[PDB]
Amino acid sequence: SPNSQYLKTRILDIYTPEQRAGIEKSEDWRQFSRRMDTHFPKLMNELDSVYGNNEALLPMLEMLLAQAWQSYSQRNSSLKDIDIARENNPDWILSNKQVGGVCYVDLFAGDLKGLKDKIPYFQELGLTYLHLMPLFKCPEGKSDGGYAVSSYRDVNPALGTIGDLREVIAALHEAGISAVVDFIFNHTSNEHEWAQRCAAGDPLFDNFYYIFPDRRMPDQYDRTLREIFPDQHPGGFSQLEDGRWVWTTFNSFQWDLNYSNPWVFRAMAGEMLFLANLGVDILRMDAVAKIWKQMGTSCENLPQAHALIRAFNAVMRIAAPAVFFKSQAIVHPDQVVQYIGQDECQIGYNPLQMALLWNTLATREVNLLHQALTYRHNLPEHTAWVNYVRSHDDIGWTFADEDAAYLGISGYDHRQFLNRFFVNRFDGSFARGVPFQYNPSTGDCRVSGTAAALVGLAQDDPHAVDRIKLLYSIALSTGGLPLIYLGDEVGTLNDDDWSQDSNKSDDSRWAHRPRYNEALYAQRNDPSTAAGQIYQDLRHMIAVRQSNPRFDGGRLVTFNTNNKHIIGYIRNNALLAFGNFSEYPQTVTAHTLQAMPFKAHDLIGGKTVSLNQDLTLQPYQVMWLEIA
Ligand SMILES: OC[C@H]1O[C@@](CO)(O[C@H]2O[C@H](CO)[C@@H](O)[C@H](O)[C@H]2O)[C@@H](O)[C@@H]1O
Ligand SMILES: OC[C@H]1O[C@@](CO)(O[C@H]2O[C@H](CO)[C@@H](O)[C@H](O)[C@H]2O)[C@@H](O)[C@@H]1O
Ligand SMILES: [Cl-]
């Protein structure tokens, strides 16, 4: 039954009495020792519930915490300053000053050096937070856009070196920007040293993955598994050349790590420590839902999965307190929120709000959006949503069917409409998206396409610009950390030649992953062009959000607009937000506006607005009203 003091002397064992004296009197040790006393009990409790009486548990922990000391000992002192800051301010994530951006290093800026050169622009745009897409060594050719990781410790050589990454992170900190990076902890590539060695039968790598002699067990699992990339293969398994089968939730070249082995936790915790010491502020925990497998279940959102993530959290509290987790879970809304906790992932993607933003543009009806913002927005203390419009991924229509039923909506019919609308198979749709993973056996389908393509900008729809403005306004103002897909701010369209690369032709997500459009960025300071209007709008909303404390925190209360086309919510009893999702003008009545002040300044238009009479919003207009 190992404890804090026990492991601390196991750690201090390697030192001679001469250095032990200097170590024990040092601040580094004093801090580590305090943090062990505070957080180790949590680590022990979480791992005990997963690994029980496992023989490997004790020695795994002796090794892991020695590594943790050695990692913290080596940790840059600038980062140790950030550790203390974030320990003492858990709510930094909840500040209205936080605005995020995300890009592919190669597609946006060429390489890590070019990314560093682009930092003055992130400053111009107002970012405090930057997510760099998977930047690690991966298979040449097909790699799932870097999501098949061949090494967590090596940069993708097209991008530069680990030293460049260190340099870039340092420059981002100097510029007041947090560095955000993926921790792809559910699976590695099949080319990872661990995968190669486990498959070869190296006993040190026994049970690093899920490997089977035939179809017997994969057949048992497949009957309860959801299909993630049905285009690629059925179920959750792929066959090796020697005849065996390996768990592959995603592509065949992505092998699911086996977390029922305590050594796998150890291995991945060591890689996590390495990334922490790069100065990474937030790790996007990729596919959090899948890290525990259980026969007879969906192998999604299992209690042990939560417990393991909570264990990973404890390790950071002990050895790099500055590092927070970002949950990536595209599941039922009831399951999305369960990853979000101070002792789990402090922030999480908000795919419900995102999906419903696009839903509401299509139907023009705020019913589902209003419902979601009313019952599913508010979070526990010291946690926040990451609010977004578009990402590197396809759009899944992951609203709750039970929730929809109350508004007289049937799941499939609605999703079929949504899928047809956004892929331009519907009468007069403005959207120019392409299908992704149409599953003929179930009817499920997702949508690829850039924000600009989905709103009608490719064919110069006169409402397109306002649509982008409107969607982003909600992400920026509901409460939580808003994330811009970089390129959106100048209206970057689809790369229509995406499938000409034979390594990209089987994954339509590439359509919404275009290179930096030089011409559009050159027009960002010219308000005449679409790029300039979008840039001016988004830049204006960012500036308002970051300097106005009415936007602070993550809580909201919805406001009943009594118009099916207009969304209403209130921030801090002081900011009233109206968003019209109709291409026609829409009215909030005097009667409905009774409780409000007679006049209010609109932060979007810059006008004073009257609320003692009918308020009429132009097509797609957003108002940000100071009511207190
Ligand atoms: O359509 C992608 C599919 O995978 C998810 C799992 O959370 O997305 C993440 O995981 C994949 C494997 O690493 C990546 O391909 C993807 O880029 C990543 O965001 C879900 O978004 C979705 O169900
Ligand atoms: O559709 C063009 C292009 O997209 C891909 C890659 O994702 O397949 C998508 O579209 C197909 C039909 O439009 C669907 O059957 C499939 O499920 C979806 O992924 C390519 O295969 C296709 O060439
Ligand atoms: Cl997911």
From Swiss-Prot:
Keywords: Glycosyltransferase, Secreted, Transferase. It catalyses: [(1->4)-alpha-D-glucosyl](n) + sucrose = [(1->4)-alpha-D-glucosyl](n+1) + D-fructose. GO terms for cellular component: extracellular region. It comes from the Bacteria. The keyword Plastid does not apply. Its EC number is 2.4.1.4. GO terms for biological process: carbohydrate metabolic process. Changing residue 392 to N: 97% reduction of activity. Gene3D superfamilies: 1.10.1740.10, Glycosidases, Golgi alpha-mannosidase II, Oligo-1,6-glucosidase, Domain 2. Amylosucrase favors hydrolysis at low sucrose concentrations, and polymerization at high sucrose concentrations. Competitively inhibited by fructose. One of its GO terms (molecular function) is amylosucrase activity. Belongs to the glycosyl hydrolase 13 family. PANTHER family: ALPHA AMYLASE CATALYTIC REGION, ALPHA-AMYLASE FAMILY MEMBER. Monomer. This is Amylosucrase. It comes from Neisseria polysaccharea. The gene is ams.
